[PDB]
């Protein structure tokens, strides 16, 4: 998970700053900021779409999309958790129409 690697980097940066400040106090963010997923700005880790009429499929898709554009999972569009630092990967309901899925 990217979080652990970034925490290691931050620890090393802290150690280097303290090593350069000759032991002057440095600012440190209270731990819960780094220790709380529910304050991340990324994502937080329904009727099946293939039974909907094409226009209804589009409507449900647009709802899921509007959720997903702000980092929130839809009903028939779902996010896939990441490994390492990557852009979000998404799972799309496979009963959607191929054309809709491409779009």
């Amino acid at each position: 998970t990217w979080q652990q690697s970034l925490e290691l980097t931050r620890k090393m940066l802290r150690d280097k700053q303290s090593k350069k400040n000759s032991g002057q106090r440095l600012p440190v963010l209270p731990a819960w900021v780094y220790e709380r997923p529910a304050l991340l700005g990324d994502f937080l880790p329904a009727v099946p779409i293939g039974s909907l009429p094409l226009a209804s499929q589009e409507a449900a898709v647009v709802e899921d999309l509007l959720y997903v554009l702000v980092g929130v999972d839809g009903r028939y569009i779902s996010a896939q958790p990441l490994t390492g630092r990557q852009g979000r990967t998404f799972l799309v309901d496979p009963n959607l129409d191929l054309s809709i899925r491409e779009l």
């Binding site: 094409l54 129409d97 191929l98 054309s99 491409e102 779009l103």
Partner: protein, 99 residues
Amino acid sequence: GAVEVTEAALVRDILYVFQGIDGKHVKMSNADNCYTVEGKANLSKSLRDTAVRLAELGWLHNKIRKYTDQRSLDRSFGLVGQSFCAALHQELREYYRLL
């Protein structure tokens, strides 16, 4: 009863073809690099001819798309190439706004 694709459904499929993504009854034949209407669905000769005449546009669309995608990844192509690709993207978006 045979499946004949309605005018609206054929329009939707051809509009997907214009958008560069195949329809449900008209699909990109990649052995001609243009969208051909399947024969599983039964449409009149005139409808098929119109479909071909329209999928010409999808062929051109996909060509422009491939060119932009390809030149977009080469940092070596320089700022002038990137600006050409940006202008082409802009024209493409105009096309999409009409679509």
